[PDB]
Structure 1
Amino acid sequence: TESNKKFLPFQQFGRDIADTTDAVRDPQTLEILDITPCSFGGVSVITPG
Structure 2
Amino acid sequence: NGLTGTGVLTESNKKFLPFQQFGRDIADTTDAVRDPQTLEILDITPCSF
TM-score (norm 1): 0.67
Greater RCO structure (CA 8 Å; 6+ sep):
2
Structure 1: give runs of 5+ residues left out of the alignment: 41-49
Q: Percent identity?
A: 100
- In 2, Cα distance between equivalents of 1:19 and 1:3: 19
TM-score (norm 2): 0.67
Alignment length (residue pairs): 40
- Compute the RMSD of aligned alpha carbons: 1.1
1 or 2, which has the higher strand percentage? 2
Runs of 4 or more above 4 Å deviation: none
